[PDB]
Design a protein around this nucleic acid. Structure first.
Length: 49
RNA sequence: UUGGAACGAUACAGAGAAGAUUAGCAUGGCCCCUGCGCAAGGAUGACA
């Protein structure tokens, strides 16, 4: 994740590991990348792309 | 070609959660009830 731990809060570390399991950060980034691709793919002949 | 480092580096993976999870029936315990067997035992009905 991109979460920076300011001190060893072990309970918070475990919670954030459970919340961002199965590579959720990469999946979120990829999904937003795909969404921007589609929103820019639709308007390619109007934005002169 | 030949040496550092090897409690390191990188590669993969990363849920570092929490657990002997859970549905059915039968057995077993208890109290009846019903049927049959076994061993005995009660009370009672019946003329020429």
């Amino acid at each position: 994740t991109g979460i920076f731990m300011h001190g060893k809060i072990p309970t918070l570390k475990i919670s954030l590991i459970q919340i961002f399991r199965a590579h959720l950060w990469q999946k979120i980034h990829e999904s937003i990348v795909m969404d921007l691709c589609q929103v820019f793919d639709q308007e390619l002949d109007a934005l002169e792309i």
